[PDB]
């Protein structure tokens, strides 16, 4: 290295501790109740249910892998448990396999 002043890199201070804040609601979201319905509505008239003011244990739902295909096109299933949502709407109906 020849005489001079060289910009080797940039320094960033490191975090000390992690702090997490979440709205806490005693109610647990009735996700199971949506799938517990004895009879689903007709396909031409699908049923819509809104879920709010509760805590959703997506981890339990995912681990309770009773579903064949469970894919989310805008989110990853693993990240769902940590992530939080504002408005949740479940649309239930019946279709064909194809």
């Amino acid at each position: 290295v020849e005489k001079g002043i060289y910009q080797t890199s940039n320094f960033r201070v490191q975090p000390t501790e992690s702090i997490v804040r979440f709205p806490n609601i005693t109610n647990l979201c009735p996700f199971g109740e949506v799938f517990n319905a004895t009879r689903f509505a007709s396909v031409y008239a699908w049923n819509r249910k809104r879920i709010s003011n509760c805590v959703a244990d997506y981890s339990v739902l995912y681990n309770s892998a009773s579903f064949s295909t469970f894919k989310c096109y805008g989110v990853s299933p693993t990240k769902l448990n940590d992530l939080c949502f504002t408005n949740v709407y479940a649309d239930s109906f019946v279709i064909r396999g194809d």
């Binding site: 020849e2 001079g4 002043i5 890199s9």
Partner: protein, 178 residues
């Protein structure tokens, strides 16, 4: 930090020009919090030629000398024991001086460094424009030279550079048909 944003009842997050969040409202307590990135800055190593020595100084650009020890690039590098302040930043490993010399390694903001012997150390000082001078002006006084000198001074200039040709197809594909 605590802030004076004055959020509206239906408003949750602030925003920045670059679409980066810079204000929130704690969900549990409705107090308004202002978010700031943690301190950062470039690090510049001032070094004499490795042939001359292997001792160097470190400049933290526009950072507080009180905060430099908190920084993580490594080595503490004798923080506190040898610290100098300047408008460019905090300089560590350099010894201040009151004499003014010519500039050798320009640190900036008028501060220039050098590697002097006194057995050697890096000294950071204020560069000198030149030797002070004065002219004895007087409305009836002139000065006429009595002797001269012939001086030959060199002047170097570029006039051209290498003529290079690159074959696009050979470079990109390397003689492959696909």
């Amino acid at each position: 930090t605590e802030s004076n944003k004055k959020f509206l009842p239906f408003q949750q997050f602030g925003r920045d020009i670059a679409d980066t969040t810079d204000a929130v409202r704690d969900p549990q307590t409705l107090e308004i919090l202002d978010i700031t990135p943690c301190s950062f800055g470039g690090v510049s190593v001032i070094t004499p030629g490795t042939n001359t020595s292997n001792q160097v100084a470190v400049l933290y650009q526009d950072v507080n000398c009180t905060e430099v020890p908190v920084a993580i690039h490594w080595r503490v590098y004798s923080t506190g024991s040898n610290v100098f302040q300047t408008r460019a930043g905090c300089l560590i490993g350099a010894e201040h001086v009151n004499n003014s010399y010519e500039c050798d390694i320009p640190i900036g903001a008028g501060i220039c460094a050098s590697y002097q012997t006194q057995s050697q150390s890096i000294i950071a000082y204020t560069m000198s424009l030149g030797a002070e001078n004065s002219v004895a002006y007087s409305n009836n006084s002139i000065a006429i030279p009595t002797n001269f000198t012939i001086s030959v001074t060199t002047e170097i200039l570029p006039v051209s550079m290498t003529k290079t040709s690159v074959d696009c197809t050979m470079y990109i594909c390397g003689d492959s048909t696909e």
